[model samples]
Target: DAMIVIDGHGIIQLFSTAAERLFGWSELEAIGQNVNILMPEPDRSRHDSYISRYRTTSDPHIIGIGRIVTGKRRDGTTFPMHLSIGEMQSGGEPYFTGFVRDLTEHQQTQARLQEL
Candidate 1:
């Protein structure tokens, strides 16, 4: 499982070792970038708006619900992934943590088994 923790503004605050390995990003390159750097559109284009709308409306989307989505690697390849988000407040500041699992091999295995 890979991990990415972002601030309420969608700026990546921490990128874990697992995330580095899975997404081809070193901590130095990913830590301060927007989380959208790891996503594909329409999520890539509208993620900020999703967060903003959630903050304003108190409507939940990814928070507390696991979603299957696509993630983009640093090399511009896309893959299937499972993502779960959690929100919390610390030091009187709001933040969100995303737990991600790469599903490439799992999907491949399933496909092969079906073919058999």
Candidate 2:
């Protein structure tokens, strides 16, 4: 699983090696960029609202849930991926962590198991 930590503003603060491999972004390149850079639209454009809503309502709409979404790589390659959300508060600042898993290879394996 690739893990990314973003602040309340959705700006990436910490990027992991696994995340780099999955997104083709080195830690230095990813940090400070909006986490939504990894996604494809309309999610890419609407991602901030998702965070805004939760901020206003303080609901767990996605904080503890898992979702299957499309991810975009630096090379403009897109693929299905599994994403999970988590939150943490430190030093009076709130941060969100995304745990990502690529599902492409697994889906291929699933298809292979079926008769053509």
Candidate 3:
């Protein structure tokens, strides 16, 4: 239930049970919605540019890998999250699966790592 499927255009298709409960949004509510709903701040606002950037340069910003990023909840609260992403082709369309863990209590640990 940790996996999520998003289209190349970043639309949500399948959201895992783990994610649904963790994020408090059901798969029914999230499907067909923009995956950007989970992003915070600049990531949400700049996602289109980010996608275009990736398409143009074939660079990996946050796909098919893991990283720490910010998440914005439906309540408008922001939190830290660790995410792992995987890519696949569904019906000949590229899609992504992202596994996420919210980490609001480990800010200091994250800061220490960022400083290293």
Candidate 4:
């Protein structure tokens, strides 16, 4: 499923093995770190604000809505990815869960098929 769980503060709480392979970060390195570390800029820079806005206005652009976005690997490579976010409350605190699917291979395949 390549899933991750982050606290309301955007700190990673769980990083799946698939996520480790995808982002090049070990679970130990990713947990307790800001989720923005997994993102490329503009998105990385604005992530916090996006969360704050969603919380404040109850309007969401991505939450519960899947989107194609860019993700940054530890090696600083950016790749397209499918991201789906869902919110949950546990023990009276909010957390966000993300499911990711790397799209690089799929995109490449599409490009190849187009040439056929």
CA RMSD of each candidate after superposition: 1.1, 1.3, 3.8, 1.2
10 residues in a row with least lDDT, candidate 4: 54-63
Writing each residue's lDDT as its tens digit, candidate 2 over 20-109 gives 999999999999999889988898999999989889898778788899989999998899999999999999989999999999998788
TM, every model: 0.94, 0.93, 0.81, 0.94
Which model is ahead, 1 or 3, in terms of lDDT?
1
What's the CA RMSD of model 4 in angstroms? 1.2
Predicted candidate 3 versus true structure: per-residue lDDT over 2-116, tens digit per residue: 5678888888999888888667678999999888898776778788677678767877867767788888777777777888888787688777788888787698687989999
Off by over 4 Å in 1: none
Question: How would you encode candidate 1's per-residue C-alpha lDDT over 17-84 as one tens digit per residue?
Answer: 99999999998899889999998898898999998999899988678999888999999999999999
Model 1, position 12: C-alpha lDDT score: 92
Q: Model 2 reaches what TM-score against the true structure?
A: 0.93
Listed per model in order, the count of residue pairs whose N, CA or C atoms clash below 3 Å is 0, 0, 0, 0
In order, candidate lDDTs are 0.92, 0.92, 0.80, 0.92
Report the Cα lDDT for residue 62, model 4. Answer: 82
